[PDB]
Design a protein around this ligand. Structure first.
Ligand SMILES: *[C@@H]1O[C@H](CO)[C@@H](O[C@@H]2O[C@H](CO)[C@@H](O)[C@H](O)[C@H]2NC(C)=O)[C@H](O)[C@H]1NC(C)=O
Ligand SMILES: *[C@@H]1O[C@H](CO)[C@@H](O[C@@H]2O[C@H](CO)[C@@H](O)[C@H](O)[C@H]2NC(C)=O)[C@H](O)[C@H]1NC(C)=O
Ligand SMILES: *[C@@H]1O[C@H](CO)[C@@H](O[C@@H]2O[C@H](CO)[C@@H](O)[C@H](O)[C@H]2NC(C)=O)[C@H](O)[C@H]1NC(C)=O
Lengths: 180, 188, 22
């Protein structure tokens, strides 16, 4: 296969959370913000090349939830088995003192799609300019997710990506420090 | 906390040689378990597990539903390829390349030469190390292909070597964004 | 220029929502 486009959607109970997104060769083209009924492109420029009626995703989620209600009953209410995530923290590119870079926390191979993620600097939470992606699909049907934190490299700053998952016995933390 | 129940739906469109050969798949999952699916290669729904048998039977008896699904390769898959083709399939971003020393042990000195290739797209790439003009393979280690989640990729291909005065190292990068291999030399 | 979505099929006619087991 030269290319693959995947329309992925899901609904979860009792959290009552659902997502709808299109993936192209592992990357996200866009997702729909349920609450706002708006199409959110992964890259700004995409909204000038195409369009999608967000209203359709809401209709789809309605069906997925209805199917979950029925399949939860027919499966005798057997709960999903928690699968703990694998976390990786790396920079967008080689680090250089006083040169703007970006820290990336890559959470992969886990389910259900629910996680608490916090960027810690020297042990204290940081939210300045932090961004994230929705839950992305995998061929093994688990989930992937990215978290970003733009920072200014320094030998005085230590970072950690703290991740919490119901399949994890304790908060998982990944450390990162400038290599001097 | 409490038990969770997850329903998953994936509609897949697989393309081989553009839109010359296209395959549509509609897959239903419950708690990570695929129970029923439509595959354009078959033309009807097929149960994947016991839970999906009654579902396949009910859906398959509705020919009007099956006809619509049989037309997705054309009015869904090929249609969407046409729309995003220009900024996805044809997307190309040149890689940034840098070579620098690193230590496999903060103790002693630099004994690793890193060829960093970043910000590129698509993910398909080839990196080779050369010492004094001869390709080196036995001492090469890498992070493998790394996806940044933002339509860019990167990879670190490290050469385990102890530089000596006079030696010349060369990192060679081959990628769809360029019609000629890119090279960065490093001299000890 | 318009991306189309594929529409899933309802497994049943039931329009009931029940509170999942504790
Ligand atoms: C999950 O389904 C199984 C089998 O359908 C249930 O197993 C037993 O079912 C009988 C009635 O058919 C009950 O009298 C027993 O108490 C059940 N034993 C157990 C604990 O497995 C099972 O009850 C169902 N799960 C639940 C607890 O709802
Ligand atoms: C994310 O964090 C929240 C808040 O700490 C977690 O919710 C708590 O979970 C504990 C179980 O260890 C309960 O005792 C608390 O009552 C919960 N707080 C409330 C009121 O919501 C939640 O479990 C975490 N989610 C994940 C996926 O790790
Ligand atoms: C690759 O895909 C093309 C269609 O995009 C297949 O068809 C070729 O199409 C070109 C023009 O678009 C013609 O000039 C060729 O004659 C076609 N191929 C032949 C020889 O029939 C092409 O066949 C596909 N490649 C293969 C061999 O699978």
């Amino acid at each position: 296969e030269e290319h693959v486009i995947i329309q992925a959607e899901f609904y979860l109970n009792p959290d009552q959370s659902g997502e709808f997104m299109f993936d192209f060769d592992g990357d996200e083209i866009f997702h729909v913000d349920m609450a706002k009924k708006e199409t959110v492109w992964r890259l700004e420029e995409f909204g000038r090349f195409a369009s999608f009626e967000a209203q359709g995703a809401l209709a789809n989620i309605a069906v997925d939830k209805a199917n979950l209600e029925i399949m939860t009953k027919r499966s005798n209410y057997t709960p999903i088995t928690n699968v703990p995530p694998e976390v990786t923290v790396l920079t967008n590119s080689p680090v250089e003192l006083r040169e703007p870079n970006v820290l990336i926390c890559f959470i992969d191979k886990f389910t259900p799609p629910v996680v608490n993620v916090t960027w810690l600097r020297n042990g204290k939470p940081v939210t300045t300019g932090v961004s994230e992606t929705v839950f992305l699909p995998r061929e093994d049907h688990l989930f992937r997710k990215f978290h970003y934190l733009p920072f200014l490299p320094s030998t005085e700053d230590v970072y950690d990506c703290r991740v919490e998952h119901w399949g994890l016995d304790e908060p998982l933390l990944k450390h990162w420090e400038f290599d001097a | 906390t409490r038990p969770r129940f997850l329903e998953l739906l994936k509609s897949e469109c697989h393309f081989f040689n553009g839109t010359e050969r296209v395959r549509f798949l509609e897959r239903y999952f419950h708690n990570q378990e695929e129970f029923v699916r439509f595959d354009s290669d078959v033309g009807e729904y097929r149960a994947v597990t016991e839970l999906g048998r009654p579902v396949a039977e009910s859906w398959n008896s509705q020919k009007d539903l099956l006809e619509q699904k049989r037309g997705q390769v054309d009015t869904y898959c090929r249609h969407n390829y046409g729309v995003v083709e220009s900024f996805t399939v044809q997307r190309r971003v040149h890689p940034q390349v840098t070579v620098y020393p690193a230590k496999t042990q903060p103790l002693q000195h630099h004994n690793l030469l890193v060829c960093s290739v970043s910000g590129f797209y698509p993910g398909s790439i080839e990196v080779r190390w050369f010492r004094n003009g001869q390709e080196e393979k036995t001492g090469v280690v890498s992070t493998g292909l790394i996806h940044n989640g933002d339509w860019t990729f990167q990879t670190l291909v490290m050469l385990e070597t102890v530089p000596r005065s006079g030696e010349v190292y060369t990192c060679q990068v081959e990628h769809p964004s360029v019609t000629s291999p890119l090279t960065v030399e490093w001299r000890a | 220029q318009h991306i189309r979505c594929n529409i899933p099929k309802r497994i049943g006619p039931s329009k009931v929502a029940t509170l999942v087991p504790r």
